Amino acid sequence: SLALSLTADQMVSALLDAEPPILYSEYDPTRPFSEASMMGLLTNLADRELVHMINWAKRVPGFVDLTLHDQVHLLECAWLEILMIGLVWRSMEHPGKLLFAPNLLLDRNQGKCVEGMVEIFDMLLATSSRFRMMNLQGEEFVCLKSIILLNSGVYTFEKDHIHRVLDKITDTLIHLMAKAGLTLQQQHQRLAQLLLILSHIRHMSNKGMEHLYSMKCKNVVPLSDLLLEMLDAHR
């Protein structure tokens, strides 16, 4: 392979270099939100971000080693978790707000613009707060996002290779913590803290998927073909 021979420093560099761009919303700030316009803006953003996600995934060491079909399955499983961890990271230094885009920064109460969305906002905000509590580092974040991509769908399948790469990312996280001056005990504790947050991200994705499906049914706004296919992969 190639990912398996990467050093920890090289893994970090690779993941940092692979980062997708931060996209803007087409939001016109002179007009108040409606349920329809809000969902429109949010889903338009997701659709555009998905295209860049595919490019990023291809640059995650080890991902390209998998069959096309396995790559498809992992992204289908993990796409919303991946968008969400991105959002939570961006919103870290904005307590009480969700930075969907630099020009789309939403307060908790703006979640009530859309039926059923505020509960999802509350979970996302709680995750952002936790990241803040922990002083999550950018290098840690990119490791976590890659773990989500490789792990989320690996049990619904190749697999041994994914697990070897996952082990390398764990090694990378520990390396970062060691570099940061953490004791062995602190490293293990922090590793666990970070990985347990992925359970909450999974939970949020599942709830988000149900919400997006309901908004699709209500027919609030029309989703893109890609979004529709990515959504349909979960049912």
Binding site: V51, I54, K58, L68, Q71, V72, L75, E76, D225, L226, E229, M230
Partner: peptide, 8 residues
Amino acid sequence: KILHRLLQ
């Protein structure tokens, strides 16, 4: 699927 083509 569109995801299929994008990956290619």
